[PDB]
Symmetry: D3
Subunit: 234 residues, 6 copies
Amino acid sequence: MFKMKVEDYFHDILRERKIHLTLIDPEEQTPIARAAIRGGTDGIMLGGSTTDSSELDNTARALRENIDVPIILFPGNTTGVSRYADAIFFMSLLNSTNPYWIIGAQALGAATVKKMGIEALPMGYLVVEPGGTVGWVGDTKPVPRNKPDIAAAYAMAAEFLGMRLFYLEAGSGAPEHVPEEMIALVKRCTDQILIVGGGIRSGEDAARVAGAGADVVVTGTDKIREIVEGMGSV
Amino acid sequence: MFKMKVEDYFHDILRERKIHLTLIDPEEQTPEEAVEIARAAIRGGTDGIMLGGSTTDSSELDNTARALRENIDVPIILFPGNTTGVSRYADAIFFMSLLNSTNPYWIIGAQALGAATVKKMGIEALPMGYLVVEPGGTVGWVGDTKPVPRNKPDIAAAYAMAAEFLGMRLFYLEAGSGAPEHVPEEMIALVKRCTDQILIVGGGIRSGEDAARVAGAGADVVVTG
Amino acid sequence: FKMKVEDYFHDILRERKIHLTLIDPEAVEIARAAIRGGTDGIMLGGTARALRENIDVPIILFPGNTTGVSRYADAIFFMSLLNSTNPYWIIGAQALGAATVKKMGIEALPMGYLVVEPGGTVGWVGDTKPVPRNKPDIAAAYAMAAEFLGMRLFYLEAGSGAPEHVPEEMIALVKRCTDQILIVGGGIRSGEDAARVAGAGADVVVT
Amino acid sequence: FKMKVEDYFHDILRERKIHLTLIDPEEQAVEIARAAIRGGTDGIMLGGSTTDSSELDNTARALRENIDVPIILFPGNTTGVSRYADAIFFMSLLNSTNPYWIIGAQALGAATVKKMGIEALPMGYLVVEPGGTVGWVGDTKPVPRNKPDIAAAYAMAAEFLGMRLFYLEAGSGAPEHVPEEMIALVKRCTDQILIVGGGIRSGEDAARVAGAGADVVVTG
Amino acid sequence: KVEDYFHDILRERKIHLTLIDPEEQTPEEAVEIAGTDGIMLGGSTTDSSELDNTARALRENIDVPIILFPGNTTGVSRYADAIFFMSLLNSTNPYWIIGAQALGAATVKKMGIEALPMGYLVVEPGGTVGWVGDTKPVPRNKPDIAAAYAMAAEFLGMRLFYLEAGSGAPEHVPEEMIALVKRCTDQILIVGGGIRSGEDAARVAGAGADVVVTG
Amino acid sequence: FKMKVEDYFHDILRERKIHLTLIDPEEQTPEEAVEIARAAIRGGTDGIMLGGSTTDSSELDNTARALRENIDVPIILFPGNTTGVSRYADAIFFMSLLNSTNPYWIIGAQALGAATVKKMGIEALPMGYLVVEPGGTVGWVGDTKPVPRNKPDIAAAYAMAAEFLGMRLFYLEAGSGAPEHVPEEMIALVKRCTDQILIVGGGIRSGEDAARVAGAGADVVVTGTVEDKIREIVEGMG
Ligand SMILES: O=P(O)(O)OC[C@@H](O)CO
Ligand SMILES: O=P(O)(O)OC[C@@H](O)CO
Ligand SMILES: O=P(O)(O)OC[C@@H](O)CO
Ligand SMILES: O=P(O)(O)OC[C@@H](O)CO
Ligand SMILES: O=P(O)(O)OC[C@@H](O)CO
Ligand SMILES: O=P(O)(O)OC[C@@H](O)CO
C-alpha cells in the first residue's frame, strides 16, 4: 500500500536524487520485489504485456500487502488495470501508426480507471529505433537512434498536450539502451519527468542514461544495487 | 494584445459566468474587415476572438492576426486546422488533438511537427481534447474522423475522461461549422459530470436559445462562427 | 457443461434453431429467467460470472476485446471482425489473446464477425465500414471468404439496439452461399422480429 | 480418381516430409516441373507475383498436361486464380497493416474461387524478417527473427480462426531461411500443417528447416 | 486517338459513354447492348477472363472505342482501345490510390494500350466502389471538398476527373459541385452515378459535365 | 518576360543535365541563405530549391524574399507540408509521396494546399515523389515504406504508375544526409521505363556521386547538405 500521491512521491525524491523503478511481468513471475527493495528500488512497475487480467490481480494483490513502495501499473493493453495498484502510467503510444494504441485503448479503459480510485500519471510513450516487442505489437515506427530531433519533437508535443511524464522506450531486451544524445535533447526541451527504459543492465548503463538527463530508470531484465549505485555515481 | 495568461483569464470569468468566443476565418475576409467584425463582436460582450477553423495560407493568418492584435484588447486565440494555423501575433494556441480521427497525423503527427515552432514563438499552449460529433461538418471529413454518434454520449465521455487522464485540461465538443443542430444537451451534460475539464462547445450555435441550452447543459465555453 | 459446445449446437440444429441470451456485466436471475424461457445458452460479452455454477446451459464468451477471456466459460466465439479498417480488430487482438485461450481449456469456435448498417457501438469502436442494408452481395462475399479461411461460424451483427434487424435478404443470401452456422443478432425484440430472422435462414438467434 | 490435395498431403505426412516447387508464371517451361518431379517434388506451386492472369492460365494448362502431382495456386492478388489448378492456398497475410491483404482481397476473389471447383486450403501467411518483395508489397511488419513468440501468437490465432495450414514466409531469395527456433516453436504450439519457405537453397537448409518442425518445404 | 476523339467531339457537343459489365451478361448479349459515343468496360473486381472474351467480342463488331474502366488490377485487357488509368483519390487506403496502380502499370506498358490520366472521386452516398474502395464519400453538401481534390488532381497531371455517385445511386452527383469543379480546373469532367432519366442527363450535362456515363 | 520553369528545364536538357541547390529556411538566416545561393550560382547551379523541412512559413517567406531580390535563377518550392507554400517563389514541385502508407502525404495535404497554390500565381510542376532506402527524415515523417535498394522493379513500377497518372517529373529520394545516393541500377531502370524528367537527390556530395548519378540516367541532380563544392558536382555531371 502507498499512503500518498505517487506523483508527489516522485517529486520528493527528485529534490535529492534520481528515481529507479523495477518492472515485473506477471506471466513470467508467480505472485523479486522484496529483493529489489533491498537493492534500493523506489517502486514496482507492474505489467508491460497483454496477459489475462487475473494473474495481474493476484500479483497486484500479493504486492500491495507485502511491500511499502508504490505499485504503478504499466499497461500494455486495457487488460492492465487493477484496483490493487497505487497509480497507473496512463500512457499514449505516441509514435504508433494505429490510433488504437494512441487514444483508442485509452478511451475504452478510462471508465474502469475512474470507477476505481487509481492515481493516473499522464505519460507520453515513445519507442526508439530498436523497440522490442512493444514496438512491433504497438504498430510503431521506431525513432531512429540518430534522429533525436524527432524524439524531442514528440516530447514537446506531449507536453503541450498536458503530458507531464515522458518515457523513452528502447523495448525490453534492447541490445543497447536509448542513446545518450536523444535523452539529453529531450531533457533540454521540456519540463517533464523523463523516464528511460530498455536494455539497461549494468550500473554503467544506468550511469550513462542517468547522466544523460533521465529522471527515472526502468529495469526488468543484487543487480539493482549495482544499478542504483550507478545512478548515484553522477 | 492581452499580456497575461489566457487560461487564468478564463478561470477568472468562470467564477461568475460562462465564456463566449468568436471564431473568425482568415480565408473569408480581409484583415481590416475582421477587425470590424471583432470590434463589433466585442459590443456583444464576447470574451475573446478565436482565429482559424480552416487550413489556409499562413500569411493571411499573420496579417489578420497582426491587425487584430493591434486593434482589440481581448485575447486572440488560434484555432488551428493544421500546422499552418500558428502565428506569433496570437495570445494563445489551442494545442489540440483530434481524438476520434483514424489518422495519427491529426492526433499527434501535426502536433509534433508544429511544436518546435510554437515553443520558438512565445505562444501559450492550452492542452485540449478535440472531439467531432455527428454530422461533423468539414473538419469531420478532412480530419479523417469517425464522428461520435449523437445518441452515444458514453463514447464522448469515454474520450473526454481519457483526455483528462492524459493531461488535457480543456475539452471541445465540435459539431462542425454549419451544423444543423448543436451537440445534444445530453452529451454535454454527461461529459461535464465525468471530468474536471473546461468544456468548450462549438457547431451550429446560432440563436440565444441554442446558447441557453448548450450553456445550460453544462458547457463552460460556447463558440460561434 | 460437458462437453463440446459445437456438438451441442449441431445436435440441436438437427431438430430446431438455436437461441442464445447475451448477458452484459451480478444477477443470475436474468439467465435463469431466459433459461426457463427456453434459451439454449448464455453469451457473455462487453467478468466473473463464476455464477454458473448455477446454470446448466453453456457459457460462451462474446469478447469485445482481449479483456473478454475468462476461465469460467465453456467456449469462446474466437472471432475476427472482418469488415474493420483496423488490423487490430481483424487479427491483432486475436493474436495477443491467443495464448491465454490455449493456456485455459476454453473451446474456441472459429467465427467471422460482420457489422451491418447501422452497426451500433461495436461498429464504431471496431473501426468498421458497416455493410449497407441494400448490399447483401458484400455480405455473401465475406461469408464465403471467411468460410474458405476455415471459419465455420458467421455472425451478422446489426449492433445492439439496432432500429431494424439485419435484412432478411442478406441472411438468406449468406446461407445460400456457404455451409456455416449462421448467427444473426441486433435489434431482435419481438417474436415477429425473431420470426423474420429465423425464417430467413439464421441458424442461431441472439437477444 | 483424383483425391483432395489436403488428403494427399496427410497421406505423405504419415511417413515423410513434403516438398513443393514454386514456379513463377511471369519468369518463363514444363521442363522445370518435369525435372523437379524426377528429383522428388510432391507438387507444383504456381504464383508469387501480381501479374497478368493469362501467363498464369497458359502455364497452368501446360502443367496440367504433363504432370501427375497437384498444381496448387500461390496467389499474390485476386489475379492469381486459374480454373486449371487442383487446389488454392486461400491465404490471409496476417502481419499486414492493410486490411486488403488480410481479408479484403480474399473477399473480392471468393466468388471466383467458388464458381470454379477449386479446393481451398485455409492458410495463415506470415512474413518473417527480411520479408522480400511480398513483405514490401503486402504492407507488412515482418516478424523479427529473434521474436518467435510473435510468430507463435499468430499461428495460434490463425488456428483458432479455422486455418489448418500455416506458412512461415521469409520472402523470396532471403539470405537466411526462417530460423529453426521459430519453426520449432510454432510447430509446438499448433496442430497445423506447417509450411516454410524462402532462402532454402542447399540440402542442409532443408534438413534444418525440416528438422526444426516444418511439415512442408517450399523452394523457388 | 481516344483523347483526340474526345476533344474533337466536345468542340460541338457533349460526350456520352455506355458502361457495360462483363460479369452481368454473356459476350453475345454484351455485343448486343452496344447515339452513344463509346463503350466503357468494367466497374468491378471480377474474373479477368470474362474481361478478355467480352473485349474481343466487342473489338470486332463495333467502331467506337472500348475503354477499360478498371475496378482493380484484374481490369487490364489487351483487346481494349484505351484505359482510364485512375487513382481513387478520396480513399483512406493507399492501395486504391497508388498501390494497385503500381502493380498494374507494367501490364499496361507491356501492352500498347493508351492510358488516360484520371482522378476518380466517390461522392456521397458512393455505392459499392465507395465501400470496396474504403472511401470517405464527399458529402453532397461540400462541393469545396470536391473542387479542392479536382484542383490537386490537375496539378498532379490528371487531365480527366470523374465525379462518382456510385452505381445505382438514388440521387445525382449534385448540380452545383459539378459546376464548382468545372469552374476551378481545366479538366475533362466526367460524371456518372444514378443518371437514369433523360431529365437527369439534361441536369448533369448542363451543370458542367463534359462527359456523362450510364449503366 | 520570365520563362516557365519547365521550359527552362527543357531548354537546358537539350544540351546538358540540370543542377538544383536545396536550401532549408530553418537552418540559416535569409542573409546567410543569399550567400549560399550566390556561391552556388558561381559554381554552375541552375536553380534554387526552397524547402526540405516542415517549418513555419515565416522563415520561408523571409528566405524567399531575400532570394527573389538577389538572384536571377528560378526559385522552386520543395514542400514538406502545406507550410511549404510561399507566394514569392517562381514554381512549386506539386508532389505526391507515392510510397507513403498515409493518404495525407499522398493526396490529402495536396488537396488542402491546392486552393492556395491556384490563388497565388505559382506554377505547379506535377511530380511523383518516391523514397528509397534509407529514406532519411522524410521517409520517417512521411510514413513511408522506403524502396529497398535492391528492388529497382518496385521503383520502376511507381515511376511507370506516376507517369500514367500524368506526373511528368519523378524524384528518387534517398533522404537528406544519406550515406549513399540512390543506386545506379535503380536510376537506370527508372529512366528506361519512362520519359519523365528524372530527378535524383540525397547523398550526392562529391563530383563522382554526381557523375555516377548523372551517368545512370538522371536528368536532374539535387544537393543541399554541403560553398563552391557545386563546381565539382556540376563538373562531374559533364
Ligand atoms: O529491457 P528491460 O530492462 O527489461 O526494460 C523493460 C522496458 O520495458 C523498460 O522500458
Ligand atoms: O457553426 P459555426 O458558427 O460555424 O461554428 C462552428 C465552429 O465551432 C467550427 O469550428
Ligand atoms: O440488440 P441485441 O438484442 O442486444 O443484440 C445485440 C447483439 O447481437 C450484439 O451486442
Ligand atoms: O523462392 P524461394 O526463395 O525459395 O522462396 C519460396 C517462397 O516461399 C517465396 O515466396
Ligand atoms: O449504373 P449507373 O447508376 O448509371 O452508373 C454507372 C456508372 O456511373 C458507375 O461509375
Ligand atoms: O543529402 P542532400 O545533399 O542534403 O540532399 C537531400 C535532398 O535531395 C533531399 O531530397
